């Protein structure tokens, strides 16, 4: 039974190492969500600091890949940082060679192709991570593209990842069934973040303090992460209506 140890086909045409890499994805017990506004793309992720001895400012699963592209990871931090370093290198190389900023969907494809190679070549293991890339693309506008250990990727109107992804996914589905549009019809990114947090609260059934969340925002020509105090201002606005 060595067809379960390396990435070769089982008698059912399955790759068990890929399937087990998907399971490693939920080892952190963290849920993430991504949505698109008119002018922006928002990504939110749970933040858990279980040890008091930790420096909470260094605990993060959101990465600034390039000026325009942000990446949230669902999976163990070593593999997350492996993917982060590579995506940063790829995005910089792209700009150097082709004279323009790497699009979010193209970076997703590139990382997905790399992930595909780990499912076909035996010596390389899959990374136990799901990568959600976000930006405001200059051609396609607000963009969410998500990659997994199988090497699969696709664009999203909105998406969710983690142990409780299904609850969040269905909550988002029901909203877009009502509105009948592919985005959050809102001008400011602040309100799109408020929407994202509200619908995560509704889906998970849990309240959040400023230290329980982590927020990334993509606008035209920059991606940035919110501080604890920026998130607090967001939580106050939600509670006041």
């Amino acid at each position: 039974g060595y067809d379960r140890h390396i990435t070769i086909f089982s008698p059912e045409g399955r790759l068990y190492q890929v399937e087990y890499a998907f399971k490693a994805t939920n080892q952190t017990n963290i849920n993430s969500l991504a949505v698109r506004g008119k002018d922006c793309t928002v990504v939110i992720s749970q933040k858990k600091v279980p040890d008091k001895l930790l420096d909470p400012t260094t605990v993060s699963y959101i990465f600034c890949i390039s000026r325009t592209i942000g990446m949230v990871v669902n999976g163990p931090i070593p593999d997350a940082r492996n993917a982060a370093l590579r995506a940063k290198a790829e995005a910089a190389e792209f700009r150097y060679k082709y004279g323009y900023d790497m699009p979010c969907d193209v970076l997703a494809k590139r990382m997905a192709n790399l992930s595909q190679i780990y499912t076909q070549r035996a010596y390389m293991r899959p990374l136990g991570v799901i990568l959600t890339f976000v930006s405001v693309d200059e051609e396609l506008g607000p963009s969410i593209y998500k990659t997994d250990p199988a090497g699969y990727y696709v664009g999203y109107k909105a998406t969710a990842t983690g142990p409780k992804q299904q609850e969040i996914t269905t909550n988002l589905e029901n909203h877009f069934k009502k509105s009948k549009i592919d985005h959050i019809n809102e001008e400011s990114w602040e309100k799109v973040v408020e929407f994202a947090i509200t619908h995560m609260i509704d889906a998970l059934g849990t309240e959040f303090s400023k230290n329980d969340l982590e927020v990334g925002v993509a606008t035209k020509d920059k991606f940035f992460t919110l501080s604890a105090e920026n998130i607090e201002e967001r939580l106050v606005a939600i509670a006041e209506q």
Partner: peptide, 18 residues
């Protein structure tokens, strides 16, 4: 800055580490 790094490659920043 204080860090602690495990066999998995995992590391975080710490106030104290052991």
């Amino acid at each position: 800055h204080l860090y602690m790094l495990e066999p998995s490659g995992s590391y975080w920043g710490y106030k104290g580490a052991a």
